[PDB]
């Protein structure tokens, strides 16, 4: 069905393990705007994986510009 190359890159990133890679994967498969047909089950899987991969991370302030 010729999944776009950017979609394949995001899937590879999610397989490696990232939280945004699956965020922008359950919002790419849940709407028609991003350019791919909406699949609900395979978007729900990406949403669950994105939420599961958030644990263990620390939120810190990196830089600042006054």
Partner DNA sequence: AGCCGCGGAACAAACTTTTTGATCCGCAACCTACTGGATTGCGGCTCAAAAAGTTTGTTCCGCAACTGTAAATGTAATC
Q: What own/partner pairs with CB < 8 Å and gap ≥ 24 does 57-65 have?
A: 57/19
Instruction: For residue 16, state whether it binds DNA (rule: CB under 7 A).
Output: no
Q: Is 51 in the site for DNA (CB under 7 A)?
A: no
2 part of the interface to DNA, by CB under 7 A = yes
- Give the nearest distance from C-beta 35 to DNA in angstroms: 6
Q: Is there binding between residue 38 and DNA (CB under 7 A)?
A: no
CA distances from 52 to 19, 46, 65 (A): 8, 10, 33
CB-nearer residue toward DNA: 40 or 52: 40
């Amino acid at each position: 069905q010729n999944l776009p190359s950017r979609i394949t890159k995001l899937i590879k990133k999610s397989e490696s393990g990232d939280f945004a890679s699956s965020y922008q994967l359950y919002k790419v498969f849940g709407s028609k705007e991003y350019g791919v047909e909406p699949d609900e089950k395979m978007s729900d899987y990406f949403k669950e994986l994105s939420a599961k991969q958030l644990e263990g991370g620390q939120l810190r302030v990196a830089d600042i510009h006054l």
